[PDB]
RNA sequence: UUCAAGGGCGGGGAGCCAUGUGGACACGACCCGAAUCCGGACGAUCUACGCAUGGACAAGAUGAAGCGUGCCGAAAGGCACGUGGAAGUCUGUUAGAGUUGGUGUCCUACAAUACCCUCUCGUGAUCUAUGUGUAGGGGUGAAAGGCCCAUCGAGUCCGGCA
RNA sequence: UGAGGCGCCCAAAAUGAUCGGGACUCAAAUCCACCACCGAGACCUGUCCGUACCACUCAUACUGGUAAUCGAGUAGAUUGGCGCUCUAAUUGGAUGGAAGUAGGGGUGAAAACUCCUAUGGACCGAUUAGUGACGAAAAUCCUGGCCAUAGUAGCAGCGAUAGUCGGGUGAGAACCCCGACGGCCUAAUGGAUAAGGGUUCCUCAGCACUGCUGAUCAGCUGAGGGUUAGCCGGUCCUAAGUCAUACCGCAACUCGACUAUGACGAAAUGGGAAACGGGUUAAUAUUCCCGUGCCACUAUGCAGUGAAAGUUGACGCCCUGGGGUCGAUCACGCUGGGCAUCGCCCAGUCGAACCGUCCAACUCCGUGGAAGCCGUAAUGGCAGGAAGCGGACGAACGGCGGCAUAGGGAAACGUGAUUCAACCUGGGGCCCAUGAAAAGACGAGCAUAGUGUCCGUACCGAGAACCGACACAGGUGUCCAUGGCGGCGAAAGCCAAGGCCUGUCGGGAGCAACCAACGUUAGGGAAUUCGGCAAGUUAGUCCCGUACCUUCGGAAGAAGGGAUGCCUGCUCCGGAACGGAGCAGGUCGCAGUGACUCGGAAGCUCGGACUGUCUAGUAACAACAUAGGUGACCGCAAAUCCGCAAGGACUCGUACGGUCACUGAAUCCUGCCCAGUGCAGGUAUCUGAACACCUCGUACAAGAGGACGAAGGACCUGUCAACGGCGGGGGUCUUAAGGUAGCGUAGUACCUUGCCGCAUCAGUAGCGGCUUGCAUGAAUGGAUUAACCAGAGCUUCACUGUCCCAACGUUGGGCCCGGUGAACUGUACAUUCCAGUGCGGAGUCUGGAGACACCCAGGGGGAAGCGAAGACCCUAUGGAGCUUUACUGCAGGCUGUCGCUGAGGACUCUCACUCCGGGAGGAGGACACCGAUAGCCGGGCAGUUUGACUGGGGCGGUACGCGCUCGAAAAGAUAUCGAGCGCGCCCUAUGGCUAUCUCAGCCGGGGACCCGGCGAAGAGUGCAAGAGCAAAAGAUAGCUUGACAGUGUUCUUCCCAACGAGGAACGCUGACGCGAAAGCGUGGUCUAGCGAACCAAUUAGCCUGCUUGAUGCGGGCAAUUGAUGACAGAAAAGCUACCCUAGGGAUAACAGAGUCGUCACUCGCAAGAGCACAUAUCGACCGAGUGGCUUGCUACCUCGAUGUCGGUUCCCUCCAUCCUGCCCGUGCAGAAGCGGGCAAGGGUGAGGUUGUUCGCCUAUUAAAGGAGGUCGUGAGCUGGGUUUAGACCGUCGUGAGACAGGUCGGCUGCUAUCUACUGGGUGUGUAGGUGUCUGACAAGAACGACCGUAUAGUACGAGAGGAACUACGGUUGGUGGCCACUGGUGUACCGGUUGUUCGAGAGAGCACGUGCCGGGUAGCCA
RNA sequence: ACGCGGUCGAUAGACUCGGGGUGUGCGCGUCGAGGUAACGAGACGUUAAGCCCACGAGCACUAACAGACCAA
């Protein structure tokens, strides 16, 4: 047959690329030698096209102007701190080791100094649980207990823009506008609605996947469609 | 070959070469005749979809939130009028886009997809120009096997090839 | 009373009857005889030829001889010869005329040879031996040329109907130019331009070419000429993004991703230093020239120390205030023009960049001091300081002054105002959407001077300059969006500025038929049709008023009702408008949204929620999307995906994420099932590869085995919003469960037009209800649903030429004339018609009939018309796309192992390697990545296969390998999907021999046993059938292993007649068994019980392996066993309606033809009943026929196409007669029924469901008959149904996909050559003229039918009821004609009136060929 | 193609009547709701008006003239 849509994606042609030339910046934590002698002033609040959430423009002492992944509650004028000796307050960044257990954190690093990888989406937050000299335990938004180097930097507070998902798009047009700001091909034609030549589920008088949808993990691309290595399906049991 | 016997093959000197010709096999194999398959190339001046930079949408209708005034109420609020001007909102041959029916006209055409009337959309998932990207078992596809220069259930060109 | 001969009845078919025809009757018939003739290429006979043979001969050279016993021929075999090219040898011809060509003479059976004459003007032969790109009627053959077609189609159709009269030029003028008159275009038919074109631009001279006719013209031809820039583009910047170099990959590169660097990337339309006005040319022009101005750089001089912070460049969508120019308009003045019943109408009244100046809004400061005020269109503002007052900063492409005794104008050479595009500046709102960058500029003065190069510059920009082969009705971007009336308007309609008469052939006929567009139609009003298709109805605005239902938004402009002009004078809102809303009075018309513009309305049902998407070019939908619902994967060194790799998308992303799927708004809901399949988890035990390890083997190795055992499987569990499933039976069974809520005859229900009801005169429709659901049912989503819809179906009101039933008219064609001028098609012949025949569907054959030639117009019956090597069907050891648990493989994932890889069945470490980090260093770590290999999964991908037979194919079957009987026709052989029926073994005895013996069955004496008799065979003999067998081939007993080894002959397999395996009979040799012996035993009495090569194993001996010896392990001779049943041997599944090719009438579908079981109809016999009574009437059984309407059968015609059903329209026919006419019978009183006879003249109609045919139904009727004509009729119509491509449901299928089920949508080409006919002409014949006739022939339905009255309330009859002859009046259908009457038309005409233009008036144009409305003469019509 | 007339003529047109269609012309005068007036839709009279006719009659005024040819 012909390659399925999932395979066209991989080629990275314009149709499937994100509008990177329109994205602002990558809210990665600042790099400080040591001391925490770094503080900046929130100069403005902006809209981040790549995340549909607000971002805070900050001006640091040493003269560096950079956008930051803002938690909820940060406003113009406010002063933020970044470093080991940073004050324990919303909007400030410091290594987990300095954060007190039971404090909601966001933009958590996976490996000390990487800039932040976890809990960066609207209204989410990781929960710092256990402390130690060898391992900091964090409960990520998915509910998973993650073991991180106490040296991994993070920001206090939850990510700005919470509740974004509570309002329905209501119309295709609204979905449309949002999709135009992401690396995604939309709308979506169902596999069962295509010709046999175009998808494993295509073909047949009436629409239906003439086969079980739960596909094996070992399936090759082009065949791995439907419910990938499902441990179970449905709502029952 | 055979305890044995019986079979098979061969045996009392004619061949070798040349020229013409009959016929066989491989090769194009008396000549033309078709749908393929494969290789390397050339196409996104059409069109599909994306991106960049620009452009277009008379006029009218309806009258959401919000706000106001008055009245009622302890209050929460309610009621009336006004204001306001929302909307993949309505009418609309505005521009522009499209095409339900006539199974009209045409059907060696004006035209290898045209003409007329009727019809639909017309502030948005809108329409449109130019630039730009994606290439052949690959693209692109709100999916019709649609579209990728009058050609697509696998483009075109030349070659494989007689 | 029997028999025979001929005939009669029985006896009905479709265009025109037939024995071939005429026609024949003591025959021209039939039968019995006879007589004489005609009549082939046969037979006889003369001559000749060929061939075979004979004699003679070197001869196949002559000559002679023989043929009663020689003479036809497709495929094919054999042999002699003709012609063409060039070579060679020998030998000739030609300028006293070669070859070729044309016409003609002679020869040869013929291929072909040869001569003559004319032309021609230079080459040409013969013989012999060679050579070969050597012979054409054909291939939908190729190329070129050419005829008919034909002076034919086109040069008309488009909302752009365009001209006419004079004149100019010229050899020539409808279309080249001038004037007048008349028109066309207004987002274009005008102005400026982008792309693209490329000289098309201007001038002169031309008309052979090009131009839909002509041409003096031109985008054509010839020759010249034309594009001028510091300030308009380019050039500069960067955008998406591209390339180059480096680096890396790759076998490699012109290939490839990242990361660096550099460059490239915007001419209308991104950013951007600076130019305006006028004049000038045939053609350029912000470029030249005149006037004025401006920018950048540089130099000089003065000033300046500032200089980089900041600002700008620089930005989305929606609403809106303020400032404000042009334009437009109003008021008044000036200048000029127009008009002339008035006094109006038109134009102009100008003047730039630039320099200077003014500043509203926003922001801010001072003052002030609000506790309720300030302000807006709106939001809003304020003790964190409102209003007010003052101030800083600060706008226009704007105002004002200069510019300007510049320019421009014939002149005047204005002034105010309103509405205000441009442009300037603010306020508000929206985002799960956030609306470029860079160069540059400002910041940062002035004088003077110098420099400012390079490239583009014409023209078109489109119904003739671009693309579409064209001077193509198509396509093609930008700006002019503010010209006047109009009105809501960038709408219509009319008119300016400007453009044009080139959406380029004309002339003529009251101008016929017919067609395209269109106007008007009395009465009826959807009767038309599948369907109101088409057309129409409604319509603008204001007032009143508005239902069910609803998601409370909506439904809604629901519906329904009323008003609407003009004139006079006013009121209200507003600053005002040349803005809006009303009032009073007057008044005209048929009509006041007067034209134009401008909704028909309502209800029920199905589907999809909605806007949106789609098959460029037959599908716009119910299909796709969608928000919403749901499930799955993944913590980021992730999941998913691309790349061979280097690397990459997702991703400037991080679970409120984004990937993979399903369902498809809201609302109420979403049951049961984990057995199979899928996925996932677990797993004692079982199973599970390679490496390493161990044993055997080998001096080594191959190899055999063992131990260990990863993923995987077995096994267990979870999971259905995972594939899917929810039956049959009984009051459980398969296979897990056994269908819950709902809905239900459905777009799912075959039965089926289900049943009831509604509605209609009548309703296969539709709606409601019931519902056992052939075969509904819950995210394969169920139900339901307001709103929405060019979606499917139904009903109503209104309206109407859809119809009854057609008419008249309008414009363009059509017809005639000038000019221009194709194509399709053509084996030939061709004036046909009726029948027949024929490969059964003939203009050409046969028989008749008819037929004087040619031409014009027509509508299309036929040429199975033209156009396409049938799309349907089958066939091919064809193709392709698609599917899967088909065959075989390939990627990919998982997993073990080896290398990378290090130190001290579980562990630590660090040093390789990986990752994070700017770095230090941190994390990880011998793992991971990567290289190699092994096991599992693996339609993601590739190549293939998927057989044959067959009354076409599929399904079914196997007549696909064997045996018997019959078919089989008395030797042998012999077919069909022919009839009956078997074999794929079984048996160590059920084999072999010998001895002894005789069996079924029946009878007699004491179903077991014993005795006797009869008993040729009916028993038994393994199994089909047919056959064989009695001191046996059977039985019993005993013994035995010949069911043995080797090797043949012959027959069979395969008649004849070649072919393997297999089989049989018969031998020889060896060794045996039994018997006295002869002899018997090569399995079972005979005919079924079977298998190649390659490979393996096995048996016994021997041969052999690369210099040589030994050992291992191989190779071979002979044979046994292991299977291919598609059985003389491939390893092997499907779909295609997305399809494709080659062919087939070798093979199906429609139709034809044959048949006639079926069907229709008839006849014979007449049981039976009809109260009695065969025969008034009904009529079983059985028997005999006719037809060719039904169905079946066949495969004869046709696959290089003969278009389907139904309907429609139009014509002819048949009779087996429904009515009408005339009759007979009656269980006939009458009236009326019932049955029958002659008879085809005429008639046989309108409607409801349904595509329907048929049929069911309704009201009428004299009756509302049936059938044939290719189931007449698509070069006539329709397109509802059938029958492609899209889609849905049910059922089936794992799936692709299917269904002889349902359902929505879905394209109909052509200019007529011949023939045929309807009408119209010209000629010839009879044979200068006029007028009048005749009548062979030919056509008719010219007439058919009904009602009523008198007869008559009579005859008849108890009564009830109730005729006829005949004479009348009328209706209906058909027919021919006519217009006084009624009606229609009537773009003659007259009138009314809306918008606009001509100033008003008068009088007119346009609004489609009448703007609209009213009336209507002639004529034509019903 | 056919039919009629051609001066021995009414064949066609002009003109005039007749017969028809429409519906009361231009202009002027009076009136006219009003309005100081200007002005004024419309009404009445003149007006069986005006305009028009594919028909008929009369009428040689114009045109059927002039004239060419064939023919037993
Ligand atoms: Cl989303
Ligand atoms: Cl010869
Ligand atoms: Cl330019
Ligand atoms: Cl404002
Ligand atoms: K055929
Ligand atoms: Mg970031
Ligand atoms: Mg996008
Ligand atoms: Mg979808
Ligand atoms: Mg599809
Ligand atoms: Mg597939
Ligand atoms: Mg393009
Ligand atoms: Mg309002
Ligand atoms: Mg004779
Ligand atoms: Mg010689
Ligand atoms: Mg030749
Ligand atoms: Mg031939
Ligand atoms: Mg013709
Ligand atoms: Mg033209
Ligand atoms: Mg009518
Ligand atoms: Mg009907
Ligand atoms: Mg319609
Ligand atoms: Mg006022
Ligand atoms: Mg339905
Ligand atoms: Mg829809
Ligand atoms: Mg289409
Ligand atoms: Mg549509
Ligand atoms: Mg669905
Ligand atoms: Mg369920
Ligand atoms: Mg489904
Ligand atoms: Mg035909
Ligand atoms: Mg064919
Ligand atoms: Mg194939
Ligand atoms: Mg395949
Ligand atoms: Mg025999
Ligand atoms: Mg084999
Ligand atoms: Mg063996
Ligand atoms: Mg065989
Ligand atoms: Mg084909
Ligand atoms: Mg045949
Ligand atoms: Mg046949
Ligand atoms: Mg009869
Ligand atoms: Mg009677
Ligand atoms: Mg008749
Ligand atoms: Mg019939
Ligand atoms: Mg037919
Ligand atoms: Mg026909
Ligand atoms: Mg047709
Ligand atoms: Mg035709
Ligand atoms: Mg239908
Ligand atoms: Mg399909
Ligand atoms: Na192939
Ligand atoms: Na393109
Ligand atoms: Na249409
Ligand atoms: Na391809
Ligand atoms: Na041809
Ligand atoms: Na012309
Ligand atoms: Na819409
Ligand atoms: Na299961
Ligand atoms: Na079901
Ligand atoms: Na729609
Ligand atoms: Na009509
Ligand atoms: Na015809
Ligand atoms: Na295919
Ligand atoms: Na096969
Ligand atoms: Na069968
Ligand atoms: Na044999
Ligand atoms: Na018969
Ligand atoms: Na028909
Ligand atoms: Na009759
Ligand atoms: Na036919
Ligand atoms: Na047709
Ligand atoms: Na038909
Ligand atoms: Sr990052
Ligand atoms: Sr980083
Ligand atoms: Sr499917
Ligand atoms: Sr459940
Ligand atoms: Sr493009
Ligand atoms: Sr809309
Ligand atoms: Sr609209
Ligand atoms: Sr249609
Ligand atoms: Sr029409
Ligand atoms: Sr067409
Ligand atoms: Sr194409
Ligand atoms: Sr080739
Ligand atoms: Sr012969
Ligand atoms: Sr012969
Ligand atoms: Sr014309
Ligand atoms: Sr046309
Ligand atoms: Sr000439
Ligand atoms: Sr550049
Ligand atoms: Sr304004
Ligand atoms: Sr055009
Ligand atoms: Sr003009
Ligand atoms: Sr012309
Ligand atoms: Sr009329
Ligand atoms: Sr109807
Ligand atoms: Sr369409
Ligand atoms: Sr729902
Ligand atoms: Sr399971
Ligand atoms: Sr039930
Ligand atoms: Sr014709
Ligand atoms: Sr059949
Ligand atoms: Sr025997
Ligand atoms: Sr199957
Ligand atoms: Sr289909
Ligand atoms: Sr008869
Ligand atoms: Sr009768
Ligand atoms: Sr029926
Ligand atoms: Sr039929
Ligand atoms: Sr018929
Ligand atoms: Sr149809
Ligand atoms: Sr003659
Ligand atoms: Sr009586
Ligand atoms: Sr007109």
From Swiss-Prot:
Q: Which GO terms describe its molecular function?
A: rRNA binding; structural constituent of ribosome
Q: Which residues cross the membrane?
A: none
Pfam families registered for this protein in UniProt: Ribosomal_L2, Ribosomal_L2_C
GO CC terms of this entry: cytosolic large ribosomal subunit
Summarize subunit and interaction data from the UniProt record for this chain.
Part of the 50S ribosomal subunit. Forms a bridge to the 30S subunit in the 70S ribosome. Interacts weakly with protein L37Ae.
- Tell me which HAMAP family the record gives: Ribosomal_uL2_A (MF_01320_A)
Query: What name has this protein been given in UniProt?
Result: Large ribosomal subunit protein uL2
Gene transcribed to yield this protein: rpl2
């Amino acid at each position: 047959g012909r390659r399925i849509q999932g395979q066209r994606r991989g080629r990275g042609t314009s149709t499937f690329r994100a509008p990177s030339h329109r994205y602002k910046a990558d809210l990665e934590h600042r790099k400080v030698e040591d001391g925490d002698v770094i503080a900046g002033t929130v100069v403005d609040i902006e809209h981040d096209p790549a995340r549909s959430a607000p971002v805070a423009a900050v001006e640091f002492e040493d003269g560096d102007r950079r956008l930051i992944l803002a938690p909820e509650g940060v406003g113009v004028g406010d002063e933020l701190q970044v470093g080991v000796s940073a004050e324990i307050a919303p909007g400030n960044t410091l290594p987990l080791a300095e954060i007190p257990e039971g404090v909601p954190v966001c933009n958590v690093e996976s490996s000390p100094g990487d800039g932040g990888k976890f809990a960066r989406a609207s209204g989410v937050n990781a929960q710092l649980l256990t402390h130690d000299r060898n391992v900091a335990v964090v409960k990520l938004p998915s509910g998973e207990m993650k073991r991180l180097d106490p040296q991994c930097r993070a920001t206090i507070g939850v990510v700005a823009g919470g509740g974004r998902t509570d309002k329905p798009f209501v119309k295709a047009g609204n979905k449309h506008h949002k999709m135009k700001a992401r690396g995604t091909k939309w709308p979506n034609v169902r596999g069962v609605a295509m010709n046999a030549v175009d998808h494993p589920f295509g073909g047949g008088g009436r629409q239906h996947p003439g086969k079980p949808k739960s596909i094996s993990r070992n399936a090759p691309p082009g065949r791995k469609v439907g419910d990938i290595a499902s441990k179970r399906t449905g709502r029952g049991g």
